[PDB]
Amino acid sequence: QIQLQQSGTVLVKPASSVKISCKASGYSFTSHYMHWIRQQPGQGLEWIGWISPEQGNTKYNQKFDGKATLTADKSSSIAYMQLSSLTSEDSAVYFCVSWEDWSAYWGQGTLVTVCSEFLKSWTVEDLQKRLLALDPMMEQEIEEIRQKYQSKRQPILDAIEAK
Amino acid sequence: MDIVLTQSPALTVSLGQRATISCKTNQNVDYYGNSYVHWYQQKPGQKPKLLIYLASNLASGIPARFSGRGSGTDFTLTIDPVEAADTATYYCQQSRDLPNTFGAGTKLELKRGSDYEFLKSWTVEDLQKRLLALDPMMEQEIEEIRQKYQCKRQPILDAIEA
Protein backbone atom coordinates (compact mmCIF):
# COMPACT_ATOMS: atom_id res chain seq x y z
CA GLN A 1 0.00 0.00 0.00
CA ILE A 2 2.08 2.91 -1.29
CA GLN A 3 0.78 6.27 -0.08
CA LEU A 4 1.72 9.92 -0.50
CA GLN A 5 0.11 12.47 1.83
CA GLN A 6 0.70 16.05 0.72
CA SER A 7 0.88 19.45 2.37
CA GLY A 8 -2.28 21.33 3.28
CA THR A 9 -3.85 24.27 1.50
CA VAL A 10 -1.69 27.40 1.39
CA LEU A 11 -2.81 30.93 0.52
CA VAL A 12 -0.02 33.39 -0.18
CA LYS A 13 0.52 36.95 -1.34
CA PRO A 14 2.08 37.67 -4.75
CA ALA A 15 5.87 37.51 -5.25
CA SER A 16 6.40 35.38 -2.12
CA SER A 17 7.49 31.73 -2.18
CA VAL A 18 6.13 28.53 -0.66
CA LYS A 19 7.37 25.00 0.04
CA ILE A 20 5.09 21.96 -0.04
CA SER A 21 5.87 18.40 0.98
CA CYS A 22 5.03 14.88 -0.19
CA LYS A 23 5.46 12.29 2.57
CA ALA A 24 6.25 8.87 1.08
CA SER A 25 5.49 5.53 2.74
CA GLY A 26 5.27 1.92 1.58
CA TYR A 27 8.29 1.69 -0.75
CA SER A 28 12.03 2.33 -0.69
CA PHE A 29 12.05 6.12 -0.90
CA THR A 30 15.35 6.30 -2.79
CA SER A 31 14.53 3.50 -5.24
CA HIS A 32 12.01 5.41 -7.40
CA TYR A 33 11.92 8.98 -8.67
CA MET A 34 9.43 11.51 -7.32
CA HIS A 35 7.73 13.49 -10.09
CA TRP A 36 5.69 16.64 -9.56
CA ILE A 37 2.56 17.66 -11.46
CA ARG A 38 0.89 21.07 -11.70
CA GLN A 39 -2.79 21.55 -12.53
CA GLN A 40 -4.05 25.10 -12.93
CA PRO A 41 -7.73 25.75 -12.08
CA GLY A 42 -9.87 24.24 -14.82
CA GLN A 43 -6.79 23.18 -16.80
CA GLY A 44 -4.86 20.04 -17.69
CA LEU A 45 -1.82 18.36 -16.20
CA GLU A 46 1.80 19.49 -16.52
CA TRP A 47 4.93 17.62 -15.46
CA ILE A 48 7.21 19.93 -13.47
CA GLY A 49 10.20 17.64 -13.02
CA TRP A 50 11.56 14.76 -11.00
CA ILE A 51 14.06 14.11 -8.22
CA SER A 52 15.94 10.95 -7.34
CA PRO A 53 15.90 10.73 -3.52
CA GLU A 54 18.98 8.49 -3.48
CA GLN A 55 21.43 11.19 -4.60
CA GLY A 56 19.29 14.33 -4.74
CA ASN A 57 19.53 14.42 -8.54
CA THR A 58 16.91 16.64 -10.17
CA LYS A 59 15.60 16.95 -13.72
CA TYR A 60 13.19 19.66 -14.80
CA ASN A 61 10.66 20.82 -17.30
CA GLN A 62 12.14 23.79 -19.15
CA LYS A 63 8.99 25.81 -18.43
CA PHE A 64 9.45 25.62 -14.64
CA ASP A 65 13.19 26.38 -14.56
CA GLY A 66 13.70 28.96 -11.83
CA LYS A 67 10.10 28.55 -10.64
CA ALA A 68 10.28 25.19 -8.84
CA THR A 69 13.19 23.66 -6.92
CA LEU A 70 12.88 20.03 -5.87
CA THR A 71 14.40 18.65 -2.67
CA ALA A 72 14.30 15.33 -0.85
CA ASP A 73 15.13 14.18 2.68
CA LYS A 74 15.85 10.45 2.68
CA SER A 75 16.23 10.83 6.44
CA SER A 76 12.50 11.54 6.70
CA SER A 77 11.34 9.94 3.41
CA ILE A 78 9.79 13.30 2.48
CA ALA A 79 9.92 15.05 -0.89
CA TYR A 80 9.75 18.83 -1.20
CA MET A 81 8.95 21.38 -3.88
CA GLN A 82 9.50 25.10 -3.43
CA LEU A 83 7.73 27.57 -5.70
CA SER A 84 9.34 31.00 -5.72
CA SER A 85 8.30 34.43 -7.01
CA LEU A 86 4.65 33.45 -6.91
CA THR A 87 2.28 35.06 -9.38
CA SER A 88 -1.36 34.39 -10.21
CA GLU A 89 -0.28 32.00 -12.97
CA ASP A 90 1.12 29.84 -10.16
CA SER A 91 -2.25 29.42 -8.42
CA ALA A 92 -2.76 25.69 -8.97
CA VAL A 93 -3.00 22.23 -7.44
CA TYR A 94 0.32 20.39 -7.23
CA PHE A 95 0.61 16.61 -7.15
CA CYS A 96 3.53 14.34 -6.36
CA VAL A 97 3.75 10.96 -8.10
CA SER A 98 6.04 7.97 -7.76
CA TRP A 99 6.00 4.82 -9.87
CA GLU A 100 6.51 1.17 -8.92
CA ASP A 101 6.35 -1.46 -11.69
CA TRP A 102 4.05 0.54 -13.99
CA SER A 103 1.78 1.55 -11.11
CA ALA A 104 1.55 5.27 -10.35
CA TYR A 105 0.83 6.47 -6.82
CA TRP A 106 -0.56 9.99 -6.68
CA GLY A 107 -0.68 12.37 -3.77
CA GLN A 108 -4.03 13.90 -2.93
CA GLY A 109 -2.81 17.32 -4.10
CA THR A 110 -1.87 20.65 -2.53
CA LEU A 111 -3.93 23.74 -3.35
CA VAL A 112 -1.83 26.86 -3.89
CA THR A 113 -3.83 30.07 -4.36
CA VAL A 114 -1.98 33.34 -4.98
CA CYS A 115 -4.01 36.48 -4.30
CA SER A 116 -4.26 39.30 -6.84
CA GLU A 117 -4.83 52.13 -2.10
CA PHE A 118 -8.63 52.14 -1.95
CA LEU A 119 -8.68 51.03 1.67
CA LYS A 120 -6.91 53.86 3.52
CA SER A 121 -9.83 56.21 2.90
CA TRP A 122 -11.84 53.90 5.16
CA THR A 123 -11.91 54.07 8.93
CA VAL A 124 -11.13 50.64 10.41
CA GLU A 125 -14.62 50.30 11.91
CA ASP A 126 -15.91 51.26 8.46
CA LEU A 127 -13.55 48.61 7.06
CA GLN A 128 -14.84 45.82 9.33
CA LYS A 129 -18.34 46.67 8.14
CA ARG A 130 -16.96 46.17 4.64
CA LEU A 131 -15.47 42.84 5.74
CA LEU A 132 -18.77 41.44 7.01
CA ALA A 133 -20.51 42.76 3.87
CA LEU A 134 -18.50 40.35 1.69
CA ASP A 135 -20.27 37.23 3.00
CA PRO A 136 -23.71 38.23 1.60
CA MET A 137 -21.86 38.86 -1.68
CA MET A 138 -20.13 35.47 -1.65
CA GLU A 139 -23.31 33.66 -0.61
CA GLN A 140 -25.11 35.20 -3.59
CA GLU A 141 -22.30 34.04 -5.87
CA ILE A 142 -22.47 30.60 -4.24
CA GLU A 143 -26.26 30.59 -4.55
CA GLU A 144 -26.04 31.11 -8.32
CA ILE A 145 -23.92 27.96 -8.45
CA ARG A 146 -26.41 26.10 -6.25
CA GLN A 147 -29.24 27.36 -8.46
CA LYS A 148 -27.56 26.03 -11.59
CA TYR A 149 -26.99 22.63 -10.00
CA GLN A 150 -30.48 22.45 -8.52
CA SER A 151 -31.77 22.75 -12.09
CA LYS A 152 -29.29 20.11 -13.28
CA ARG A 153 -30.56 17.95 -10.40
CA GLN A 154 -34.26 18.36 -11.13
CA PRO A 155 -34.56 15.95 -14.11
CA ILE A 156 -32.83 13.22 -12.09
CA LEU A 157 -35.07 13.82 -9.08
CA ASP A 158 -38.17 13.74 -11.30
CA ALA A 159 -37.03 10.52 -13.00
CA ILE A 160 -36.43 8.85 -9.63
CA GLU A 161 -39.91 9.96 -8.58
CA ALA A 162 -41.52 8.67 -11.77
CA LYS A 163 -40.04 5.20 -11.20
CA MET B 1 11.12 19.60 -29.49
CA ASP B 2 8.32 19.26 -26.95
CA ILE B 3 5.80 16.64 -28.01
CA VAL B 4 2.27 17.98 -28.51
CA LEU B 5 -0.63 15.68 -27.63
CA THR B 6 -3.93 16.64 -29.27
CA GLN B 7 -7.18 15.37 -27.77
CA SER B 8 -10.68 16.76 -28.16
CA PRO B 9 -12.00 18.69 -25.13
CA ALA B 10 -15.41 17.01 -24.82
CA LEU B 11 -17.14 13.68 -25.43
CA THR B 12 -20.88 13.25 -24.84
CA VAL B 13 -21.84 9.56 -24.88
CA SER B 14 -25.06 7.85 -23.88
CA LEU B 15 -25.02 5.60 -20.83
CA GLY B 16 -24.05 2.05 -21.74
CA GLN B 17 -22.61 2.74 -25.20
CA ARG B 18 -19.01 2.72 -26.37
CA ALA B 19 -16.92 5.84 -25.73
CA THR B 20 -13.66 6.45 -27.59
CA ILE B 21 -11.12 9.04 -26.46
CA SER B 22 -8.58 10.00 -29.13
CA CYS B 23 -5.02 11.23 -28.62
CA LYS B 24 -2.88 12.53 -31.48
CA THR B 25 0.85 13.12 -31.08
CA ASN B 26 2.86 15.41 -33.34
CA GLN B 27 5.81 13.01 -33.02
CA ASN B 28 6.31 9.26 -33.10
CA VAL B 29 6.47 7.92 -29.54
CA ASP B 30 7.07 4.24 -30.33
CA TYR B 31 10.39 2.91 -29.02
CA TYR B 32 11.41 -0.72 -29.61
CA GLY B 33 7.98 -2.31 -29.94
CA ASN B 34 6.34 -0.16 -27.25
CA SER B 35 4.61 3.21 -27.44
CA TYR B 36 4.95 5.65 -24.56
CA VAL B 37 1.41 6.94 -24.20
CA HIS B 38 -0.41 6.50 -20.89
CA TRP B 39 -4.00 7.19 -19.93
CA TYR B 40 -5.45 8.71 -16.78
CA GLN B 41 -8.90 9.35 -15.38
CA GLN B 42 -9.57 12.36 -13.15
CA LYS B 43 -12.94 12.78 -11.52
CA PRO B 44 -13.90 16.26 -10.25
CA GLY B 45 -12.20 17.00 -6.95
CA GLN B 46 -10.03 13.88 -7.16
CA LYS B 47 -6.45 13.07 -8.07
CA PRO B 48 -5.59 11.55 -11.46
CA LYS B 49 -5.62 7.76 -11.71
CA LEU B 50 -3.69 5.59 -14.16
CA LEU B 51 -5.83 3.40 -16.44
CA ILE B 52 -3.53 2.31 -19.28
CA TYR B 53 0.26 2.32 -19.61
CA LEU B 54 2.29 1.83 -22.78
CA ALA B 55 -0.75 2.35 -25.03
CA SER B 56 -2.46 -1.01 -24.52
CA ASN B 57 -1.78 -2.30 -20.99
CA LEU B 58 -4.43 -2.30 -18.27
CA ALA B 59 -3.29 -1.05 -14.88
CA SER B 60 -3.80 -2.80 -11.55
CA GLY B 61 -7.38 -3.02 -10.30
CA ILE B 62 -8.74 -1.23 -13.37
CA PRO B 63 -12.01 -2.67 -14.74
CA ALA B 64 -12.13 -4.64 -17.98
CA ARG B 65 -14.44 -2.15 -19.72
CA PHE B 66 -11.41 0.13 -20.17
CA SER B 67 -9.06 -0.65 -23.04
CA GLY B 68 -6.39 1.27 -24.90
CA ARG B 69 -4.93 0.86 -28.37
CA GLY B 70 -2.93 2.79 -30.91
CA SER B 71 0.52 3.18 -32.44
CA GLY B 72 2.87 5.79 -33.87
CA THR B 73 0.94 9.06 -33.65
CA ASP B 74 -2.64 7.82 -33.20
CA PHE B 75 -4.03 6.36 -29.98
CA THR B 76 -7.46 5.68 -28.51
CA LEU B 77 -8.85 4.87 -25.08
CA THR B 78 -12.08 2.88 -25.17
CA ILE B 79 -14.70 2.56 -22.42
CA ASP B 80 -17.25 -0.12 -23.24
CA PRO B 81 -19.78 -0.03 -21.72
CA VAL B 82 -19.82 3.51 -20.32
CA GLU B 83 -21.03 3.46 -16.72
CA ALA B 84 -22.55 6.17 -14.55
CA ALA B 85 -19.27 6.29 -12.61
CA ASP B 86 -17.19 7.02 -15.70
CA THR B 87 -18.01 10.72 -16.13
CA ALA B 88 -14.59 12.34 -15.73
CA THR B 89 -11.72 14.00 -17.57
CA TYR B 90 -9.31 11.66 -19.35
CA TYR B 91 -5.72 12.50 -20.22
CA CYS B 92 -3.11 11.06 -22.54
CA GLN B 93 0.53 11.50 -21.51
CA GLN B 94 3.71 10.77 -23.44
CA SER B 95 6.95 9.51 -21.91
CA ARG B 96 8.99 9.00 -25.08
CA ASP B 97 11.02 12.19 -24.57
CA LEU B 98 11.46 14.83 -21.92
CA PRO B 99 9.59 16.83 -20.95
CA ASN B 100 6.67 14.51 -20.23
CA THR B 101 3.63 16.12 -21.81
CA PHE B 102 -0.10 15.61 -21.34
CA GLY B 103 -3.04 16.23 -23.59
CA ALA B 104 -5.48 18.97 -22.68
CA GLY B 105 -7.99 16.34 -21.55
CA THR B 106 -11.36 15.06 -22.76
CA LYS B 107 -14.33 15.68 -20.47
CA LEU B 108 -16.76 12.77 -20.74
CA GLU B 109 -20.43 13.50 -20.09
CA LEU B 110 -23.67 11.57 -20.56
CA LYS B 111 -26.46 12.28 -23.01
CA ARG B 112 -29.84 13.04 -21.44
CA GLY B 113 -32.37 13.32 -24.22
CA SER B 114 -34.46 15.90 -25.97
CA ASP B 115 -36.93 16.00 -23.06
CA TYR B 116 -34.48 14.16 -20.77
CA GLU B 117 -35.98 11.07 -22.41
CA PHE B 118 -33.01 8.83 -21.65
CA LEU B 119 -33.16 9.41 -17.85
CA LYS B 120 -36.53 7.68 -17.57
CA SER B 121 -34.98 4.79 -19.50
CA TRP B 122 -32.25 4.63 -16.84
CA THR B 123 -32.26 2.26 -13.89
CA VAL B 124 -32.84 3.67 -10.41
CA GLU B 125 -29.26 2.91 -9.35
CA ASP B 126 -27.84 4.76 -12.36
CA LEU B 127 -29.91 7.88 -11.67
CA GLN B 128 -28.83 7.70 -8.02
CA LYS B 129 -25.17 7.76 -9.02
CA ARG B 130 -25.87 10.63 -11.43
CA LEU B 131 -27.60 12.51 -8.61
CA LEU B 132 -24.49 12.22 -6.43
CA ALA B 133 -22.00 12.88 -9.24
CA LEU B 134 -23.28 16.48 -9.33
CA ASP B 135 -21.91 17.28 -5.86
CA PRO B 136 -18.15 17.08 -6.69
CA MET B 137 -18.62 19.33 -9.74
CA MET B 138 -20.66 21.81 -7.69
CA GLU B 139 -18.18 21.78 -4.80
CA GLN B 140 -15.30 22.53 -7.19
CA GLU B 141 -17.09 25.62 -8.49
CA ILE B 142 -18.07 26.60 -4.93
CA GLU B 143 -14.48 26.26 -3.69
CA GLU B 144 -13.29 28.61 -6.45
CA ILE B 145 -15.72 31.27 -5.23
CA ARG B 146 -14.61 30.48 -1.68
CA GLN B 147 -10.95 30.70 -2.70
CA LYS B 148 -11.66 34.01 -4.44
CA TYR B 149 -13.39 35.46 -1.39
CA GLN B 150 -10.52 34.35 0.83
CA CYS B 151 -8.31 36.59 -1.29
CA LYS B 152 -10.83 39.44 -1.47
CA ARG B 153 -10.82 39.78 2.32
CA GLN B 154 -7.12 39.54 3.18
CA PRO B 155 -6.40 43.14 2.03
CA ILE B 156 -9.25 44.34 4.26
CA LEU B 157 -7.85 42.29 7.14
CA ASP B 158 -4.29 43.33 6.31
CA ALA B 159 -5.44 46.95 6.30
CA ILE B 160 -6.61 46.81 9.91
CA GLU B 161 -3.54 45.20 11.48
CA ALA B 162 -1.42 47.71 9.53
Binding site: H32, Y33, W50, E100, W102, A104 | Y32, H38
Partner: peptide, 8 residues
Protein backbone atom coordinates in the same frame (compact mmCIF):
# COMPACT_ATOMS: atom_id res chain seq x y z
CA UNK C 1 8.60 0.61 -15.12
CA UNK C 2 8.03 4.36 -14.90
CA UNK C 3 5.35 6.11 -16.92
CA UNK C 4 7.20 9.45 -16.67
CA UNK C 5 10.81 8.41 -17.37
CA UNK C 6 11.92 8.27 -21.03
CA UNK C 7 14.43 5.69 -22.30
CA UNK C 8 17.93 7.17 -22.32
Amino acid sequence: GDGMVPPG
